[PDB]
Amino acid sequence: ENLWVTVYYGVPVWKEAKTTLFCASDAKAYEKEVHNIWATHACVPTDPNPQEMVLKNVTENFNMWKNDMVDQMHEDVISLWDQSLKPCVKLTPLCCTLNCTNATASNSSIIEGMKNCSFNITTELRCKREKKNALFYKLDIVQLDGNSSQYRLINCDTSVITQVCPKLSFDPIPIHYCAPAGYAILKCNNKTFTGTGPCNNVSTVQCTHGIKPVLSTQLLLNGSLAEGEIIIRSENITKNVKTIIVHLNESVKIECTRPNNKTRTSIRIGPGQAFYATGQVIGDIREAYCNINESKWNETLQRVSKKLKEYFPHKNITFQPSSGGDLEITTHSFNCGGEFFYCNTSSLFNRTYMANNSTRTITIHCRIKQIINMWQEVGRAMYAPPIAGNITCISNITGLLLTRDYGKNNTETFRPGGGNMKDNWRSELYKYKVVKIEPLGVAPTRCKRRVV
C-alpha cells in the first residue's frame, strides 16, 4: 500500500547505438596561414580542453573490433580526399602511348633507376598535338608491344588518375572526434586492456584526444604509445587470427632522406591548369634510405617476443620478411615531406628466438613511387608531383601490424601483414566507443500531487 509512481528527467543511464560523429581539428593548418587538406574543410574550431571526467564503480563492455565509429572514420577519410581532388586537373590526355629511353643524369652516362619519358600531348586546350619530355620512376611505367617497343603508364589504362592540387599538403594533423548532442564517449583508462570484454575502470569525455591520420603499412608511426607494458591484441575466436596488433610502450626513432636534388618541369595540357612533371636530376645520386637504432631494436624484438610467448609457450618463434605478391605489401609504406616512401623491410625482420645505444646503425634501402593505389580502391589512382631539392624526414615508430602463418611442427613463423587499412586506425581507436543517453526514468515513491 501507498507505493506510488514518480518520473525523473535527465537520468544518468545509456544504451549502445550508432551515431554520426563530428570532425574536430585545428583552425588553420598548424595554426599557420596555409591550406591543409584535413583542417581547412570546416571541422569546427581548435577545441583545446578535453572534458575528461572519471567514473566511480563502473564496469563496461567493449568491443573494439565491432565498434561502429571506425566505419565512420574510414568513410570520412575516404571522402575528404575524394572531394578535395575534384577541382584539380586530371592526367587523362597524357595516358596516350610513350616512346622513351634510359636517362643520362648529370655527369653520368646512365642512371639505372630512371627512364627519360617522351610523349605526345595536347599543348593548347583541345588541339595542336606535339612532342614533350619529362622523366618518371619505373614503377609507374610498363611495356610490351610493337615491332619496336612501346611504353605506357602503369594505371591509366585500368583507372583514371588525378594529381593532387600542388598547394595542398599531405601532412597529417591531430584531429579530435566528438559525439553530437545526446551521446557520449567512453575510454578505458585501464593501462592493460585486451581490447574486448569488460573494462574495470572507465572515464568519459566529449571529444577524444587528437588522432593523426597517418597513412602507413608495416609499421605504426607518428602514433600513440601504450602507458603500461606492450599490448598485443588479436581476434578472440580462434588461435589463428585475422590480424595481430602490437603496440609499444617506448617509441623508437626513424629518420629518412631522399638525397638527390630534383628540379621541376611543368607541362601545360590546360586552361588555368598545369600537369606537373619531373625534370632534370641534380646531385650525387643515391636511393632513399632510412636509419634505425640497432641495439634498442634488439631489445624491442626481445620484449615483444617475450610476451608473444605467454600466449604461445613452446620453443620457437620465427620474425621473417614479407611473404610476397605485388609490391604494395612487401615494402614498408609511408609518406613524408611531399612523396610516398616504400622500403624493403627484409633486413630489419630477420630474427629468430628460442625458449628456455646510438651506434652500429642499421640502414634499409627504400624505394619511392609517384602513382599510387591509395585507399586500396577499385579503379582509381593518385599522382604526386615532385618536390624541389632533397628531403629529410623524422618520425617515431610505435608498433607493428603482424600476421601468423599456418602452424607447423614446434615452429611459429611471424611476419608483417594484416594489410587492411582499417587496422591502422583500429590499432589506435581501440579505447573508444559511442553511446546514447535515455534521460527519462520512472520509479515508485512515497509522493503524490494534490487533485485540486
Partner: nanobody, 127 residues
Amino acid sequence: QVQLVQSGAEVKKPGASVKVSCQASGYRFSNFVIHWVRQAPGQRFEWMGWINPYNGNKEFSAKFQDRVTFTADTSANTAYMELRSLRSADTAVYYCARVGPYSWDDSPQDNYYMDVWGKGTTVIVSS
C-alpha cells in the same frame, strides 16, 4: 610447401554455366594475385584473366570478358571462377595459378609469371 587444391571434375550442359573453385595452402591467400588458365586437348594454353584477392580488381582477356567472371574470399583461402554460356569448344582442362614474389629490383609486373599451379580440373560440355 605450397599447393593449390581445386573442385571436382565437371560435366555440364551446353548453354549453361560452369563454376570452379581453387583453395590454397602454405601461404597467405590475400597476398598473391591468382590466374586462370585453360587448355583444350592438344592445343595451346589460353589466358583467361587474373584477380588480386587483396582488392578485387579484375582484368579479363577481351575475347572472354562477356563470358567469364572471377571472385575471391579472404576468409575461405579460395578463389572462384564462373564461365557462362558453355559451348563445345570449352571442353578443356582448367587451372588456377599463383605468381612469384616481388623483389626490390623488379619493374612492375615482372613477377606475374606462373610460380605455382594446381592439379587442374576436367570440364566437358555435354548433355
